[PDB]
Amino acid sequence: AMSLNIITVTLNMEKYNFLGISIVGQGIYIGSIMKGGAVAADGRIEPGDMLLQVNEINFENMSNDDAVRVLREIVHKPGPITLTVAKS
Ligand SMILES: O=C(O)c1cc(Br)ccc1NS(=O)(=O)c1ccc2c(c1)CCCC2
Structure with a gap:
């Protein structure tokens, strides 16, 4: 049962205006x-x-x-943002 390295992240965004990320590619990656x-x-x-x-x-x-x-x-x-990413 080796990890698939899929992680889901929920950000409440109450205290933040923005994700603060850049993206690259066309998969799409955090640049x-x-x-x-x-x-x-x-x-x-x-x-x-x-x-x-x-x-x-x-x-x-x-x-x-x-x-x-x-x-x-x-x-x-306004409201939470949920990101699902591949770490492999
Ligand atoms: O929120 C992000 O980091 C973002 C990333 C990409 Br790629 C595309 C859009 C993004 N969000 S955004 O609505 O344009 C945005 C970016 C910066 C800021 C805001 C929104 C709100 C004010 C503070 C600075």
């Missing part, structure tokens, strides 16, 4: 993590992690443009 963001504060998500799902949206075959657009609309809405 970098910004200081002062909810992701940096939580600390679980790292650069090179592959983005599988954020809230109700799957990211597995999505353009970089479409990924940036969807993430803004998700971060714009």
Whole structure:
């Protein structure tokens, strides 16, 4: 029962305006993590992690443009953000 290295992270976003991440690729990967963001504060998500799902949206075959657009609309809405990432 070796780990599949799939981790799910729920951020409450009460104290943070933004995830504070950049993304690369077209899978979609965490390119970098910004200081002062909810992701940096939580600390679980790292650069090179592959983005599988954020809230109700799957990211597995999505353009970089479409990924940036969807993430803004998700971060714009108030309430928790759940990210599912592949660490392998
Ligand atoms: O929240 C992010 O880090 C983010 C990442 C990508 Br990739 C695309 C969009 C993102 N969110 S965002 O709504 O554009 C955003 C980015 C920065 C900030 C905000 C929103 C809110 C004010 C503080 C600075």
